[PDB]
Design a protein around this ligand. Structure first.
Ligand SMILES: NC1=NCc2ccccc21
Ligand SMILES: [Ca+2]
Length: 223
């Protein structure tokens, strides 16, 4: 997260870290057994880390749970990042509490201009590299589809939206992928891609979760 702020420990209790020896992506807890992330975060041997603030220090509220299965969206296209969504099932259910909590799925899509909370442990610099140990947060509005498509001609599908600031300075970044965009208490986005981080006229691009609610619900009911 570039241009954001330190969230505060466990203030984003649905935020998870995906670990394969090291943090490599975010995700969102949607019930005690299931996490949503980005398809481009797929790999084998994922451990889901819940209740994290400093990802390099055991502070006492973490739960570390191996994935038993991962399900990449059937239409995911790794070339274009269309349908950049996957589901991860936990081998044992998380113990839900104030610091480990699920986030609700959309009941409809959200409007342009709606303010959202984006969070993650990704790079905090727009030029160069610095990775935080503690979770970072950013408040950012959903941008109009025309501003999104103008920024990324030929790359935006109906399964993507942009959020952030056309002036730059505030954005998600590498290492935030798979994490949440929460608007009005609903998981409306998954951190997906962008051109650079926090650059003018290049806002972040997010998977449009509201298009996937039926797929999510049916997939988790059958797995
Ligand atoms: N907003 C983003 N710009 C580049 C990038 C990489 C990975 C996730 C998000 C972004
Ligand atoms: Ca920790």
């Amino acid at each position: 997260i570039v241009g954001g702020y330190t969230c505060g420990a466990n203030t984003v209790p649905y935020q998870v870290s995906l670990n394969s020896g090291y943090h490599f992506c975010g995700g969102s807890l949607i019930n005690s057994q299931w996490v949503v992330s980005a398809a481009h975060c797929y790999k084998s041997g994922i451990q889901v880390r819940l209740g994290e603030d400093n990802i390099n220090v055991v502070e006492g509220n973490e739960q570390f749970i191996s994935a038993s299965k991962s399900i990449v969206h059937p239409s995911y296209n790794s070339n274009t990042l269309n349908n950049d969504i996957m589901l991860i099932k936990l081998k044992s259910a998380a113990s839900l509490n104030s610091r480990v909590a699920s986030i609700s799925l959309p009941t409809s899509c959200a409007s342009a201009g709606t303010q959202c909370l984006i969070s993650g442990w990704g790079n905090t610099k727009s030029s160069g590299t610095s990775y935080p140990d503690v979770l970072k947060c950013l408040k950012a509005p959903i941008l109009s589809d025309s501003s999104c498509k103008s920024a990324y001609p030929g790359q935006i599908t109906s399964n993507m939206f942009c959020a952030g600031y056309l002036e730059g300075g505030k954005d998600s970044c590498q290492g935030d992928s798979g994490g949440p965009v929460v608007c009005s208490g609903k998981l409306q986005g998954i951190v997906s891609w962008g051109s650079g981080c926090a650059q003018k006229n290049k806002p972040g691009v997010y998977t449009k979760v509201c298009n996937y609610v039926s797929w999510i619900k049916q997939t988790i009911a059958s797995n």
